[PDB]
Amino acid sequence: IVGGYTCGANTVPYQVSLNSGYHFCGGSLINSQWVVSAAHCYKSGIQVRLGEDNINVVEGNEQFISASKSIVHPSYNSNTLNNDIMLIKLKSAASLNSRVASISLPTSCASAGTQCLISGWGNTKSSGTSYPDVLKCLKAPILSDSSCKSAYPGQITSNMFCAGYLEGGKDSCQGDSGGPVVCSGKLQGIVSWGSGCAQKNKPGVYTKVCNYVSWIKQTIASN
Ligand SMILES: [Ca+2]
User: Fold this and answer.
1) Number of neighbours of residue 97 by Cβ within 10 angstroms
2) Where are the domains of the chain?
3) For residue 55, how far is its CA from the centre of ligand 1 (angstroms)?
4) Closest CA to 20 of 39, 41, 47
5) SS (H, E, C) 108-154
6) Of these residues, 28, 70, 177, 192, which one is catalytic?
7) Cα 184–50–106 angle (5° rounding)?
8) For residues 40 and 172, what is the distance between their CA atoms, to the nearest angstrom?
């Protein structure tokens, strides 16, 4: 997250870190057994880390639970990032508590202009590299479809939305991928892509979770 703020330990209790020997992507806990992330975060061999604040210190509220199954969306296209969504099943259910909690799936799609909370352990610099140890947060508004398409001509599908600031300076970034965009208390987006981070006229692009609720529900009812 570039231009964000330190969230505060366990104030984003649905945020997970995906670890394959090191943090590589975020995700969102949607119930005691299942995480939503980005399909481009697929790796074999994922351990889900819940209850994290500093990802490099065991502070005492973590749960580390191996994945048993990962399910990339059936229509994922890694070239365009259309349908950039994945489900990860935990080998055992998390113990839900004040620091490890699920986020609701949406009923309706969020609106342009809504301010959402985006979070992660990704890079904090637009130019260069600095990865935080503690979770960072950013409030960013959803942009109109027309503004999103103007920023990335020929690249935005109906399964994507833009959020952020066309002036630059505030965005998600590498290492935030897969993590949550929460609007009105529900999971509306997944950190997916963007041209660089926090550059002028190049806002973040997010997977539009409301288009996937019936796939998520039928998949979790079956696996
Ligand atoms: Ca930790």
Assistant:
1) 13
2) 1-12+103-210, 13-102+211-222
3) 4
4) 47
5) CCCCCCCEEEEEECCCCCCCCCCCCCCCEEEEEEECCHHHHHHHCCC
6) 177
7) 25
8) 15
Choosing from 40, 53, 102, 176, the catalytic residue is: 40
Do 94 and 119 meet the contact criterion of CB atoms below 8 Å apart? no
Q: Is 84 one of the annotated active-site residues of the chain?
A: yes
Tokens of 25: 């992507």
Q: What are the residues whose beta carbons fall under 8 Å from the beta carbon of 107, sequence distance 6 or more?
A: 186, 210
Amino acid present at 156: I
Please give the resolution of this entry in Å, rounded to 1 decimal: 1.2
Method: X-ray
**Burial call 179-212: b when 16+ CB within 10 Å, e when fewer:** bbbbbeebbbbbbbbbeebbbeebbbbbbbbbbb
Concerning whether 177 is annotated as a catalytic residue, the answer is yes
Q: Which of 84, 102, 119, 192 is catalytic?
A: 84
CATH class, range 13-102+211-222: mainly beta
